Design a protein around this ligand. Structure first.
Ligand SMILES: CCN1C(=O)c2cccc3c(S(=O)(=O)Nc4ccc(F)cc4)ccc1c23
Length: 127
């Protein structure tokens, strides 16, 4: 079907306030990098292509989409003011998965595994 995909979430906004913190550096260098390499990362590495993946209802249900490709670019582009803004985006990505899909679905098992690893890495966030 199509129809169409929305514009992806922004990864640049020159008027948005931003900072480099060592916590944001750790989010890129440790948290994002480890999740990124994982065997379950691939469905979360770019925005949902609702056309290709045959998920025509995706953007009827999910109105705040987020993915690790967007987060990666936001970190590389120094988009954030603090770590919480970034952790927010990971939480949105996970939440969207759990909202759209059913417990026990293969995609949800992936999200749960990534989220478990995420929380472990988040646990060692530096001062
Ligand atoms: C994480 C974004 N996302 C979904 O919420 C979702 C639902 C259904 C399929 C699918 C896909 S898929 O069409 O590539 N199929 C897929 C099914 C189960 C998996 F464990 C991984 C991918 C990619 C990313 C997705 C989804």
């Amino acid at each position: 079907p199509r129809g169409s995909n929305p514009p992806p979430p922004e990864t640049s906004n020159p008027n948005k306030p931003k900072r480099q913190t060592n916590q944001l550096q750790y989010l890129l260098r440790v948290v994002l990098k480890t999740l990124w390499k994982h065997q379950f990362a691939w469905p979360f590495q770019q925005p949902v292509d609702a056309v290709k993946l045959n998920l025509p209802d995706y953007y009827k249900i999910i109105k705040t989409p987020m993915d690790m490709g967007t987060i990666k670019k936001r970190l590389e582009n120094n988009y954030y003011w603090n770590a919480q803004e970034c952790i927010q985006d990971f939480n949105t990505m996970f939440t969207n998965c759990y909202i759209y899909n059913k417990p026990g679905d293969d995609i949800v098992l992936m999200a749960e595994a990534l989220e478990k690893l995420f929380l472990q890495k988040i646990n060692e966030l530096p001062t």
